[PDB]
Every structure is written in structure tokens, then in C-alpha cells.
């Protein structure tokens, strides 16, 4: 099963946003092997921000 296959326009826009935030200065521990838990984390913090 797949909840996020990372190709749709708004998820790829979010992908491009955090790739740019990587490429600006620095972030924490690396990438290229993602996790759906991190996507749920991002969406839950977005839920809290909208709330």
C-alpha cells in the first residue's frame, strides 16, 4: 500500500520546499530514504497550525 508516492503537485511542491530549505544553509540527519511517519508528522503540525 502507498499513502504518499511523492509525485502529486502539492506533495511535490512540499518536497521542493524542504529540498530548498535543505539547500539554503543546513538541516539535521539526512534523507533520500524517506518515511511516511515524517509525512504524518509534517501534516499533523500543519493540522495544529491551522487549528
Amino acid at each position, epitope marked *: 500500500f502507498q499513502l504518499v508516492n511523492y509525485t502529486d503537485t502539492i506533495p*511535490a*511542491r512540499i*518536497m*521542493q*520546499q*524542504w*529540498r*530548498t530549505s535543505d*539547500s*539554503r*544553509d*543546513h538541516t539535521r*540527519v539526512d534523507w*533520500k530514504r524517506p518515511k511516511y511517519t515524517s509525512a504524518l508528522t509534517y501534516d499533523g503540525v500543519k493540522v495544529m497550525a491551522e487549528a
Partner: single-chain antibody, 224 residues
Framework: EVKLLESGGGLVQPGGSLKLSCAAS????????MSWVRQAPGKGLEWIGE????????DYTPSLKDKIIISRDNAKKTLYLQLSKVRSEDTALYYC???????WGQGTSVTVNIVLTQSPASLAVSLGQRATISCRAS??????????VHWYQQKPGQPPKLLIF???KLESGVPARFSGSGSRTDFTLTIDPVEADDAATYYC?????????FGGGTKLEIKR
């Protein structure tokens, strides 16, 4: 502004120890990560390692782990590199750099698949002109719409300053004399106007996936 100064370099005997310091000024070293990268004389660069601000995870290359130690001091804002049992391959120019706000320090000299091809190898351009340097990648370097490729210029005795970042943005401090463009297999850096101080070796490096490769080096000649 951001300033990094390396010290402790020079000459060292084979088999001994060596400690190089790198002081920072103008920024906060207690939040920004640091990195160290080596460069052989006449060859490409080689990333030695990276270290975080809290000194909790210091990463390095898998082939140079038994002879390199990276530490930092946030109170003094100074990084430290310790080498033990130096060999003939240790005669190189090391360079401490910020988290690549990408800025690289001067470094110190110690004397004891993605393929990026530059085009051309050497060219001579007059003053006040516009030069073009192309770069071809063997694999796709495009990820999430942004091309994560940096263009730097290193001179003889000078370190490679990060000129162009992400193939579409100019770095702070450098004037509006270098632009970048391209698409997904071919990158192109343009210089307009051409000054006499820009006579150095240009290098395009992409760090999209493993391994982080570097460019072949394209020297720029100023006509007279």
C-alpha cells in the same frame, strides 16, 4: 560578515600528529554545522567529513576514519581537526567550511554513478566580455524541481568561494557578474562582465545523491 580563518598548517613529519584549528567570526557556530574537505594539488576536492554544533554526530568518509578526528568548541567558536600517522597522501590543502549561508574558509596546506564533465577544459576571454561554461551530468541531478548543483571558483593559493548556489541563485557578497541556467542534464554558468580578478578554476559540484562528486576543473584565462 561571515569569516573563517584556518591555522596550524605547514609542514609535519611522517608518522606524527597534527592539529589544525579553524576560528569563525561574524556568525553563531553553536547552531551552524561545520565541514572539512581536502583537496590534492592539481586534483579535485575530497570531503573529509562534517560535524554538528552539539558535537553529537561527526560523520566522515568510510576510507579515512582511522586517521581523522573532528571536534569543535562553541564557546570559542573554533573547529579542530586532528590527524595521526600522516602519509605521503596527506600533503594536501584542507578547508573548513560552513554548512553547505554556504561559505568556505581559506584552509591550510599540509606537506609531509554521476559523472560531471566540464566544458571546455581551458578558455581565454577578454576583459568586460561574457564567458560560458557548460557542465554535463551522467545521472539526473534534478530533485523536487530544484537542481542541487553549486558552482565555485578556486584560484592558486585561494580557496573555492561558493559563487552560484542551486543553479539559479547568486550568493551574497559576490557581485552581479555570474548567472546560472540549465536543465536536468546540462548546466551553464555565464560571466558578464569579465574582470581580471576572475581568472581561476571553475568547478561545478552536485551533491544530490551518493557519492558527492566534484567537477573536473575549468581554468579561466584573461586576455590582454
Amino acid at each position: 560578515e561571515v569569516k573563517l580563518l584556518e591555522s596550524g598548517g605547514g609542514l609535519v613529519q611522517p608518522g606524527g600528529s597534527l592539529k589544525l584549528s579553524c576560528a569563525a567570526s561574524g556568525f553563531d557556530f553553536s547552531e551552524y554545522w561545520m565541514s572539512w574537505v581536502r583537496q590534492a594539488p592539481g586534483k579535485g576536492l575530497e570531503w573529509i567529513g562534517e560535524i554538528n554544533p552539539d558535537s553529537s554526530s561527526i560523520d566522515y568518509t568510510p576510507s579515512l576514519k582511522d586517521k581523522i578526528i573532528i571536534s569543535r568548541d562553541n564557546a570559542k567558536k573554533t573547529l579542530y581537526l586532528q590527524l595521526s600517522k600522516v602519509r605521503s597522501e596527506d600533503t594536501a590543502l584542507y578547508y573548513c567550511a560552513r554548512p553547505r549561508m554556504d561559505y568556505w574558509g581559506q584552509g591550510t596546506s599540509v606537506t609531509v554513478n554521476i559523472v560531471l564533465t566540464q566544458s571546455p577544459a581551458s578558455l581565454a576571454v577578454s576583459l568586460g566580455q561574457r564567458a560560458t561554461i557548460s557542465c554535463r551530468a551522467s545521472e539526473s541531478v534534478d530533485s523536487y524541481g530544484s537542481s542541487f548543483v553549486h558552482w565555485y571558483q578556486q584560484k592558486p593559493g585561494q580557496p573555492p568561494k561558493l559563487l552560484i548556489f542551486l543553479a539559479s541563485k547568486l550568493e551574497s557578497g559576490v557581485p552581479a557578474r555570474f548567472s546560472g541556467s540549465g536543465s536536468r542534464t546540462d548546466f551553464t554558468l555565464t560571466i558578464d562582465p569579465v574582470e581580471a580578478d576572475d581568472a581561476a578554476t571553475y568547478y561545478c559540484q552536485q551533491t544530490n545523491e551518493d557519492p558527492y562528486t566534484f567537477g573536473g576543473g575549468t581554468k579561466l584565462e584573461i586576455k590582454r
